[PDB]
Design an enzyme around this catalytic site. Structure first.
Site, PDB file in Angstrom:
ATOM      1  N   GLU A  26     -13.427   1.833 -13.324  1.00  0.00           N
ATOM      2  CA  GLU A  26     -13.370   1.182 -12.018  1.00  0.00           C
ATOM      3  C   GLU A  26     -14.057   2.047 -10.960  1.00  0.00           C
ATOM      4  OE1 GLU A  26      -9.836  -0.866 -10.703  1.00  0.00           O
ATOM      5  OE2 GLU A  26     -10.705  -1.153  -8.720  1.00  0.00           O
ATOM      6  N   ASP A  61      -6.681   0.625  -8.308  1.00  0.00           N
ATOM      7  CA  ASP A  61      -5.730   0.480  -7.223  1.00  0.00           C
ATOM      8  C   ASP A  61      -4.333   0.818  -7.740  1.00  0.00           C
ATOM      9  OD1 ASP A  61      -4.083  -0.291  -5.157  1.00  0.00           O
ATOM     10  OD2 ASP A  61      -4.568  -2.426  -5.322  1.00  0.00           O
ATOM     11  N   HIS A 112      -5.984  -1.039 -15.477  1.00  0.00           N
ATOM     12  CA  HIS A 112      -7.353  -1.400 -15.824  1.00  0.00           C
ATOM     13  C   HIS A 112      -7.875  -0.220 -16.641  1.00  0.00           C
ATOM     14  CE1 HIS A 112      -7.233  -4.590 -12.804  1.00  0.00           C
ATOM     15  NE2 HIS A 112      -6.815  -3.699 -11.923  1.00  0.00           N
ATOM     16  N   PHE A 137       0.509  -1.905  -0.216  1.00  0.00           N
ATOM     17  CA  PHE A 137      -0.393  -2.652  -1.104  1.00  0.00           C
ATOM     18  C   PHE A 137      -0.250  -2.294  -2.590  1.00  0.00           C
ATOM     19  CE2 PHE A 137      -2.902  -4.270   2.530  1.00  0.00           C
ATOM     20  CZ  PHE A 137      -3.181  -5.551   2.054  1.00  0.00           C
ATOM     21  N   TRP A 169      -4.787 -10.734   1.763  1.00  0.00           N
ATOM     22  CA  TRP A 169      -5.713 -10.112   2.713  1.00  0.00           C
ATOM     23  C   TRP A 169      -6.505 -11.101   3.561  1.00  0.00           C
ATOM     24  CZ3 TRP A 169      -5.561  -9.138  -2.543  1.00  0.00           C
ATOM     25  CH2 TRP A 169      -6.560  -9.731  -3.340  1.00  0.00           C
ATOM     26  N   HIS A 194       0.022  -2.592 -15.032  1.00  0.00           N
ATOM     27  CA  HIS A 194      -0.242  -1.164 -14.996  1.00  0.00           C
ATOM     28  C   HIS A 194       0.847  -0.414 -15.743  1.00  0.00           C
ATOM     29  CE1 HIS A 194      -3.606  -0.235 -12.256  1.00  0.00           C
ATOM     30  NE2 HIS A 194      -3.350  -1.429 -11.748  1.00  0.00           N
ATOM     31  N   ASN A 216      -6.247   2.346  -2.341  1.00  0.00           N
ATOM     32  CA  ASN A 216      -6.678   1.141  -3.043  1.00  0.00           C
ATOM     33  C   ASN A 216      -8.170   1.186  -3.378  1.00  0.00           C
ATOM     34  OD1 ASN A 216      -7.225  -1.426  -3.998  1.00  0.00           O
ATOM     35  ND2 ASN A 216      -6.544  -2.513  -2.155  1.00  0.00           N
ATOM     36  N   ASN A 231       3.009  -5.294  -5.643  1.00  0.00           N
ATOM     37  CA  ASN A 231       2.631  -6.689  -5.801  1.00  0.00           C
ATOM     38  C   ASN A 231       3.356  -7.255  -6.998  1.00  0.00           C
ATOM     39  OD1 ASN A 231      -0.406  -5.005  -6.071  1.00  0.00           O
ATOM     40  ND2 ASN A 231       0.406  -5.597  -4.056  1.00  0.00           N
ATOM     41  N   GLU A 285     -13.679  -4.179 -11.267  1.00  0.00           N
ATOM     42  CA  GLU A 285     -14.171  -3.927  -9.914  1.00  0.00           C
ATOM     43  C   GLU A 285     -15.177  -2.787  -9.854  1.00  0.00           C
ATOM     44  OE1 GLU A 285      -9.992  -3.730  -8.281  1.00  0.00           O
ATOM     45  OE2 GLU A 285     -10.664  -5.414  -7.053  1.00  0.00           O
ATOM     46  N   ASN A 316      -4.122   6.285   3.365  1.00  0.00           N
ATOM     47  CA  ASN A 316      -3.310   5.470   2.465  1.00  0.00           C
ATOM     48  C   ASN A 316      -3.455   3.969   2.726  1.00  0.00           C
ATOM     49  OD1 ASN A 316      -0.486   4.446   3.910  1.00  0.00           O
ATOM     50  ND2 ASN A 316      -1.379   6.262   4.892  1.00  0.00           N
ATOM     51  N   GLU A 374      -7.132 -12.107 -12.314  1.00  0.00           N
ATOM     52  CA  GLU A 374      -6.115 -11.831 -11.295  1.00  0.00           C
ATOM     53  C   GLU A 374      -5.970 -13.065 -10.409  1.00  0.00           C
ATOM     54  OE1 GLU A 374      -6.854  -8.115  -9.145  1.00  0.00           O
ATOM     55  OE2 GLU A 374      -7.698  -7.215 -10.972  1.00  0.00           O
ATOM     56  N   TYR A 375      -4.747 -13.572 -10.300  1.00  0.00           N
ATOM     57  CA  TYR A 375      -4.449 -14.677  -9.387  1.00  0.00           C
ATOM     58  C   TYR A 375      -2.997 -14.584  -8.932  1.00  0.00           C
ATOM     59  CZ  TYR A 375      -1.641 -17.445 -12.728  1.00  0.00           C
ATOM     60  OH  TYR A 375      -0.657 -17.922 -13.563  1.00  0.00           O
ATOM     61  N   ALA A 376      -2.659 -15.290  -7.849  1.00  0.00           N
ATOM     62  CA  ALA A 376      -1.285 -15.343  -7.322  1.00  0.00           C
ATOM     63  C   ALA A 376      -0.717 -13.952  -7.039  1.00  0.00           C
ATOM     64  CB  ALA A 376      -0.367 -16.132  -8.262  1.00  0.00           C
ATOM     65  N   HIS A 377      -1.254 -13.324  -6.004  1.00  0.00           N
ATOM     66  CA  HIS A 377      -0.925 -11.948  -5.643  1.00  0.00           C
ATOM     67  C   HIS A 377       0.533 -11.811  -5.196  1.00  0.00           C
ATOM     68  CE1 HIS A 377      -1.768  -7.992  -3.660  1.00  0.00           C
ATOM     69  NE2 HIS A 377      -2.682  -7.939  -4.612  1.00  0.00           N
ATOM     70  N   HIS A 390     -14.598   0.910  -7.637  1.00  0.00           N
ATOM     71  CA  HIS A 390     -14.414  -0.004  -6.509  1.00  0.00           C
ATOM     72  C   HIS A 390     -14.934   0.543  -5.192  1.00  0.00           C
ATOM     73  CE1 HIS A 390     -11.633  -3.532  -5.208  1.00  0.00           C
ATOM     74  NE2 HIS A 390     -12.754  -3.517  -4.509  1.00  0.00           N
TER      75      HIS A 390
HETATM   76  C1  LIG Z   1      -7.610  -5.750  -0.486  1.00  0.00           C
HETATM   77  C2  LIG Z   1      -8.787  -6.496  -1.118  1.00  0.00           C
HETATM   78  C3  LIG Z   1     -10.023  -6.393  -0.225  1.00  0.00           C
HETATM   79  S1  LIG Z   1      -9.176  -5.849  -2.722  1.00  0.00           S
HETATM   80  C4  LIG Z   1      -7.865  -6.338  -3.795  1.00  0.00           C
HETATM   81  O1  LIG Z   1      -6.769  -5.436  -3.641  1.00  0.00           O
HETATM   82  C5  LIG Z   1      -5.613  -5.892  -4.340  1.00  0.00           C
HETATM   83  C6  LIG Z   1      -4.407  -5.123  -3.806  1.00  0.00           C
HETATM   84  O2  LIG Z   1      -3.266  -5.242  -4.669  1.00  0.00           O
HETATM   85  C7  LIG Z   1      -5.880  -5.777  -5.843  1.00  0.00           C
HETATM   86  O3  LIG Z   1      -6.051  -4.407  -6.238  1.00  0.00           O
HETATM   87  C8  LIG Z   1      -7.137  -6.576  -6.200  1.00  0.00           C
HETATM   88  O4  LIG Z   1      -7.530  -6.277  -7.546  1.00  0.00           O
HETATM   89  C9  LIG Z   1      -8.315  -6.311  -5.254  1.00  0.00           C
HETATM   90  O5  LIG Z   1      -9.331  -7.300  -5.456  1.00  0.00           O
HETATM   91 MG   LIG Z   2      -9.898  -2.063  -7.046  1.00  0.00          MG
HETATM   92 NA    NA Z   3      -1.989  -3.324  -5.522  1.00  0.00          NA
END
Ligand SMILES: CC(C)S[C@@H]1O[C@H](CO)[C@H](O)[C@H](O)[C@H]1O
Ligand SMILES: [Mg+2]
Ligand code: NA
Ligand SMILES: [Mg+2]
Ligand code: NA
Ligand code: NA
Lengths: 1014, 210
Positions: free
Chosen positions: A407, A192, A382, A592, A990, A348, A93, A595, A452, A588, A528-531, A409
């Site tokens: 990106e 990610d 992205h 994650f 998270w 993606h 990620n 989603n 990011e 890994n 990005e909202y509502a994971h 990150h």
């Molecule tokens: C795990 C967070 C500190 S970062 C968080 O991870 C997510 C995992 O699907 C997404 O990739 C989001 O874009 C990211 O902000």
């Molecule tokens: Mg990222």
């Molecule tokens: Na993800």
């Protein structure tokens, strides 16, 4: 080439690569261009290629440039070589898949040697220019043609193009592509997602005349009311300038030419040295243009002919034109003068079989589902997408946010590269070559600077570059706090509706508060909202209530569209879904990568329906007899919509009917229901309206339901006592057990445990496990967060439960008495759940079995105020019975939870048992249904007001098993009946995300159940 | 019809338990053929002389949400002091209780009445686990007011000075009580979260002499 090491130099991002430009086909017939039919000048080199793998580029033998290697295999291209088994894909990620040592990559850099022997037609080499186009190469590559080196290219998500005109011979030819897995490019590709490589998008050969259209930009501006437009087409040529040369830009709607302009080359004076003699701008007037939007994606066709004055066509290019305006005015994102409400999703490019290779079928599949589930927008998370994506979005109607492939990150801090001027060249290429490629697609409404990567001065420079080059589109970017100077749109990720999260430097304010910070004027659309990770999208409705109340809250893009699960195989050759760590890959970030609102095979997750409901385009109010329908459409009328209403008493239809919807965009229609028939028996009248589309569209089938809503109408409470029973149940007391007998029915309560240990119908047992209280769930992804065995997060719900001992707490009996009454036996119990001297829960129950054979269970739980709030307050038991069907009167049909039940409807639902289990790839609590008043399973019936789930898997097996495919159907059926259940959350996955109103914190809880055989 | 709704008995049985007597009852409050509320109760009196009242109420979904779900009675006793474990010392309602503190409170009976110039419901105290008045003690988790003034007299009397102490002490013990609002005083202003909308409501009291 071996000496230079260009894949370790962010100064070298290409060698001999041609200029970027919009899609070219070099048609030599206008009509072919107009109809967008295939072009003889655009050859595809997709198919069977020769491929060999190497531990590093140094281990690539010299002979490979001239001769095909015997060791090599015949593989399909485009492909990711991880997907062919050559090496492992890596899911990580944030943490980079390589050591953070910019610009250096690992010496052991997996190298993919591609080759193709192909024919070039003589005609192609006699005149004009022959170029090769590699639409997607991950992550960097050198190219040789007939043993001679051609050039180098980086950036995995945009086409690299090279002139092969001088390298090609007539007859057979051989390409040699050396593809490096890691490069300085990798530092900007820390998305990610699965880390893969290879030639993964289309490879083609394009023939262009020596005198050519080298670039062209379409623009459309409007008068105040959009009743007049001017199409403006800038066309640039390469080749020798000649007085006879002309461009004709003609605009077609279907088979009608609506406008045309012809001019010689040589633009207006620009500065002291004149203008562009190699350019011409064409201006066409269009009266009453058909406007483009996701609602009605009206397209025109623009054909750009390069030709002699006398009439000889040299070539034609073309694009679809959508007449629309995108501006931000007074704090609102407007499309064609109207404020947008973005029903978006991040998407993606992922396929469970083919990896990151895309195809029309899958793309079309994705668009249809998105539009069928009320999405009107997609974010290219992205990186710039496969070119067909934009064409399809143009045509089907979706607002696209086009995002630069940047990106970083994993950097510390996140803007370490993006604030470094030495990385500006590499970054600019990722922004600029995107704009040049996609600027003519009407579906792109917003440009994004990437994802990011913090906020660096490089972002500011690129922001301004775009604003300067393309005034037609707002620029957004989330990095560095979502509201920096590099964004026209406040675009936070995972900011909550009401709750501030005041992280230092990069706070995520409540979106409602964010809008009104001193000095802030900009629209807010969440990038990005509502994971949607696992069982998620709890609290989704809260976002949409806000989006609708606040003008400047113009929506967001859900994270995300599809689970990034890959297909692996077991011993028997049976497919299963794999996530992080399932390829020997390490470090890994496990599950994650999943989603998605849909599974990798495009099967919907339960949450999808919740999104569909909340993103409805028609809003409803009820006032006695009148349904008020409001359209949230900005442009179209409801011209393919009728309202289907039904009134039902406890799942039993009484009246129904249809009214055609005739609603103007943003308008209101009052539908007056008939005088309703009087319900005889007791119960609750429910009104259900649905909006149905009679006619099939490009994106939906006939009969497609687009919106729905329910209301409670009249309730007639039952006042009739059940008629008295003759039979009276008999208590058979024992030292260890209380037996209750009535007819063939028998109830046993264990005097040492305090629980109903067994029930009999006839002389057959009904239970395999006693009926016991349950206060825990098999933890969701949202319950877990970034918690793992080696890195403990003490604040995640699962850890709070664990530390408090909810999972290992043993029931101590306090009381278990039996009393015979006039018509009933009454078992009373009290249990205390303790862990290390602390009492967490006390459960006080009464079991009243009467002459009717109906056990009335009353449960009152005390929950200690200083214990973390429990996941659920209910009962579980393993039933011996395994039935085919489950029937219930409650919210359904699909899985629903307290903070995710708005899309569920109250009715009588009947499903096979397997549908009562949701196959989340990471198994957890699942299948719950809420507001259930009656549950039927084989000979059993439970009544009351409860939530429940029913499957062949225990909460214990669900929490002890890592992948769905490793689950075994247990004997009989586990039943979970809850009076109360904690919300699932999912504003992110998270940190704890369950809102206060969905936590079980009341302290004292009461629910009552009736168990009977029917 | 909330104000003229008449109680209609549905069930009223007694049972002798091993160490207690159990009175189960069921009532319907009706108006023009419409059942508004159903009250189901058990009274459990054991050897210690404790009356455990368990109340379960159904509220028809299509009736306006009720002001309170509780019990009342007129006590013969008149004491000088009121003593309670709960929110206080002052009057507090569900949507105006943040200033109150949970503690043991002891006030003269007069203080348990608020003299609003126009009489209404008043003097309520919420989140109460124990109430003591003369010989009586009540336990559970409830809200209450206690005065010489009935709801009927309060609602029928226009001015506070026209009020007369009734014989004995009127006690209102509510499992649940609707908010009082006030965002304005010319339209419904009680928030959804403070309206009694659940449909089904449960509370339990213990009554005993101390
Ligand atoms: C795990 C967070 C500190 S970062 C968080 O991870 C997510 C995992 O699907 C997404 O990739 C989001 O874009 C990211 O902000
Ligand atoms: Mg990222
Ligand atoms: Na993800
Ligand atoms: Mg380089
Ligand atoms: Na809005
Ligand atoms: Na698990």
């Amino acid at each position: 080439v071996l000496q230079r090491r260009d894949w370790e130099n962010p100064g070298v991002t290409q060698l001999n690569r041609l200029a970027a430009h919009p899609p070219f086909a070099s048609w030599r017939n206008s009509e072919e261009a107009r109809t967008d039919r295939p072009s003889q000048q655009l050859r595809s080199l997709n198919g069977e290629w020769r491929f060999a793998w190497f531990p590093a580029p140094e281990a690539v033998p010299e002979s490979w440039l001239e001769c095909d290697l015997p060791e090599a295999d015949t593989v399909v291209v485009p492909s990711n070589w991880q997907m062919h088994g050559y090496d492992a894909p890596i899911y990580t990620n944030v943490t980079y898949p390589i050591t953070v040592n910019p610009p250096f990559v690992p010496t052991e850099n997996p190298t993919g040697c591609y080759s193709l022997t192909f024919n070039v037609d003589e005609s192609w080499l006699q005149e004009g220019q022959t170029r090769i186009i590699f639409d997607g190469v991950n992550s960097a590559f050198h190219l040789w043609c007939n043993g001679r080196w051609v050039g180098y290219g980086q950036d995995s998500r945009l086409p690299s193009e090279f002139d092969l005109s001088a390298f090609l011979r007539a007859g057979e030819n051989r390409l040699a592509v050396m593809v490096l897995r890691w490069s300085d490019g990798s530092y900007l590709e820390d998305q990610d997602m699965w880390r893969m490589s290879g030639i993964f998008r289309d490879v083609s050969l394009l023939h262009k005349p020596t005198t050519q259209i080298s670039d062209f930009h379409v623009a459309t501006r409007f008068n105040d009311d959009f009743s007049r437009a001017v199409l403006e087409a800038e066309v640039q040529m390469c080749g020798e300038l000649r007085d006879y040369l002309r461009v004709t830009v003609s605009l077609w709607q279907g088979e009608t030419q609506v406008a045309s302009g012809t001019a010689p080359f040589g633009g207006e004076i620009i500065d002291e040295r004149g203008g562009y003699a190699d350019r011409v701008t064409l201006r066409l007037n269009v009266e009453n243009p058909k406007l483009w939007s996701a609602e009605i994606p009206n397209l025109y066709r623009a054909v750009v002919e390069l030709h002699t004055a006398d009439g000889t066509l040299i070539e034609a290019e073309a694009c679809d034109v959508g007449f629309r305006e995108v501006r931000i005015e007074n704090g609102l994102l407007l499309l064609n003068g109207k404020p947008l409400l973005i029903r978006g999703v991040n998407r993606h490019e992922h396929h469970p079989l083919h990896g990151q290779v895309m195809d029309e079928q899958t793309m079309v599949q994705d668009i249809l589902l998105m539009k069928q589930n009320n999405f009107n927008a997609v974010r290219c998370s992205h990186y710039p997408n496969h070119p067909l994506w934009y064409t399809l979005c143009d045509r089907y109607g979706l607002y696209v946010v086009d995002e630069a492939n940047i990106e970083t990150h994993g950097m510390v801090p996140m803007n370490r590269l993006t604030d470094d001027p030495r990385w500006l060249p590499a970054m600019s290429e990722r922004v600029t070559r995107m704009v040049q490629r996609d600027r003519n697609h009407p579906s792109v409404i917003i440009w994004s600077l990437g994802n990011e990567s913090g906020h660096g001065a490089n972002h500011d420079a690129l922001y301004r570059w775009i604003k300067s080059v393309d005034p037609s589109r707002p620029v957004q970017y989330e990095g560095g706090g979502a509201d920096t100077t590099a964004t026209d749109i406040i675009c936070p990720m995972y900011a909550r509706v009401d709750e501030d999260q005041p992280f230092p430097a990069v706070p995520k304010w409540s979106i409602k508060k964010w809008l009104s910070l001193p000095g802030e004027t900009r629209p807010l659309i969440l990038c990005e909202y509502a994971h949607a990770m696992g069982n998620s999208l709890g609290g989704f409705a809260k976002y949409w209530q806000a989006f609708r109340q606040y003008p400047r809250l113009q929506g967001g893009f859900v994270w995300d569209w599809v689970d990034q699960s890959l297909i692996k195989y077991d011993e028997n050759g049976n497919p299963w879904s794999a996530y992080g760590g399932d390829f020997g890959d390490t470090p890994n970030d496990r599950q994650f990568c999943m989603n998605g609102l849909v599974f990798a095979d495009r099967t919907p997750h339960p949450a999808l329906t919740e999104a569909k409901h909340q993103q409805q385009f028609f809003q409803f109010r009820l006032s006695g007899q009148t349904i008020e329908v409001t359209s949230e459409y900005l442009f179209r009328h409801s011209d393919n919509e009728l309202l289907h209403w039904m009134v039902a008493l406890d799942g039993k239809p009484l009246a129904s009917g249809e009214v055609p919807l005739d609603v103007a965009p943003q308008g209101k229609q009052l539908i007056e229901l008939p005088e309703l028939p009087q319900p005889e028996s007791a119960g609750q009248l429910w009104l259900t309206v649905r909006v149905v589309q009679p006619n099939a569209t490009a994106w939906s089938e006939a009969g497609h339901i687009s919106a729905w809503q329910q209301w409670r109408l009249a309730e007639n409470l039952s006042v009739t006592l059940p008629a008295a029973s003759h039979a009276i149940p008999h208590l058979t007391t024992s030292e260890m057990d209380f037996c209750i007998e009535l007819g063939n029915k028998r109830w046993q309560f264990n005097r040492q445990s305090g629980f109903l240990s067994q029930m009999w119908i006839g002389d057959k047992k009904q239970l395999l496990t006693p009926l016991r209280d349950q206060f825990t769930r098999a933890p969701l992804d949202n319950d877990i967060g970034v918690d793992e065995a080696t890195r403990i997060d003490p604040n995640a719900w699962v850890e709070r439960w664990k530390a408090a001992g909810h999972y290992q707490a043993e029931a101590a009996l306090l009381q278990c008495t039996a009393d015979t009454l006039a018509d009933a036996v009454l078992i009373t119990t009290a249990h205390a759940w303790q862990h290390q001297g602390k009492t967490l829960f006390i459960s006080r129950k009464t079991y009243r079995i009467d002459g009717s054979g109906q056990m009335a269970i009353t449960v009152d739980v005390e929950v200690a105020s200083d214990t973390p709030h429990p996941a659920r307050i209910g009962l579980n038991c393993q039933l011996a019975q395994v039935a085919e069907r489950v029937n219930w009167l409650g919210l359904g049909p699909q899985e629903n939870y307290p903070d995710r039940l708005t899309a569920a409807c109250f009715d009588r639902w009947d499903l096979p048992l397997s549908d009562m289990y949701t196959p989340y790839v990471f198994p957890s609590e699942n299948g719950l249904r809420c507001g259930t008043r009656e549950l039927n399973y084989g000979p059993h019936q439970w009544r009351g007001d409860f939530q429940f789930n029913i499957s062949r898997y225990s909460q214990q097996q669900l929490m002890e098993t890592s992948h769905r495919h490793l689950l075994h159907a247990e004997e009989g059926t586990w039943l979970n009946i809850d009076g109360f259940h904690m919300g699932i959350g999912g504003d992110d996955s998270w940190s704890p995300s369950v809102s206060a109103e969905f936590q079980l914190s009341a302290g004292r809880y009461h629910y009552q159940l009736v168990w009977c055989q029917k």
